[model samples]
Target: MIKVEIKPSQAQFTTRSGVSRQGKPYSLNEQRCYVDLGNEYPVLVKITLDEGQPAYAPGLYTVHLSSFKVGQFGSLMIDRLRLVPA
Candidate 1:
């Protein structure tokens, strides 16, 4: 996986590709709220993964990945998301 950066606002939102709705973004693993960590001015960013893939918990982290999907995270077009540190 690669290492990247993300903000809290990016982790939680109710929008897609710059467009937004009136309620919480759809969810499968209802625990989406924890994605917020980088108190760096959250801005509707997010990460995604395929079926049967493992995920991580909340806290400060460096974005890492190998097999994630933009099927979520809005327009990121990235993959394989996970958490890491310096």
Candidate 2:
């Protein structure tokens, strides 16, 4: 299972496969939500932001794979991330 926690609120987002959805509410001091990937494998995770949300700013963000895990025979690779302006 893959778990992700975001700060601020539980804003709606979508993944590359479009199979996971998080709609629970969260505060600035709490863990937002999580999703189970079901099986470990190479996948692309994309987060779409809604209009007027200030959780993100205009900048370059890079992800480190040090804390990420993969199941047996599974691999993970992130090529790039693009953030669109609202």
Candidate 3:
């Protein structure tokens, strides 16, 4: 399981990679389920075990994202996140 939160700023924006559909640079705040952010505010994410990995491993796993971007500069921020078991 992993969690990630990100806050985009002018400084960070300049060096941002990947761009979202809105033609804005995007940054990844999580990798293999891990939080990666320096400092910010108003961003939160929550994750829970949705299913069990029988072939892989029998353990609980989940990912969280308080916020993410899909634009050219990550100008857009995400607010809420939730996952339900299927």
lDDT of 1 by residue, 1-86 (tens): 23344434334323223323875444333113233445664433445544343444334566555434666647655544555763
Tens-place lDDT per residue, model 3, 1-86, is: 34243323211211225988999775533212224334463234332322231111222233335334566675765443332121
Best-first order by lDDT: 1, 2, 3
Name the runs in model 1 displaced over 4 angstroms: 1-40, 65-77
Candidates 1 and 2 compared by lDDT, better number: 1
lDDT of each: 0.43, 0.37, 0.33
RMSD of 1: 9.7
- Ten residues in sequence with the least summed lDDT for candidate 3: 7-16
Give the range where candidate 2 is weakest over 10 consecutive residues by summed lDDT.
27-36
Task: Report the C-alpha lDDT of model 2 over 1-86, residue by residue, as the tens digit.
Answer: 23443334444443222222585543221112323345574233445433344444423333335434565668854332223332
What TM-score should be assigned to candidate 1? Answer: 0.31
Question: Candidate 3, TM-score vs. the true structure?
Answer: 0.19
Clashes of 1: 11
Local distance difference test, candidate 2: 0.37
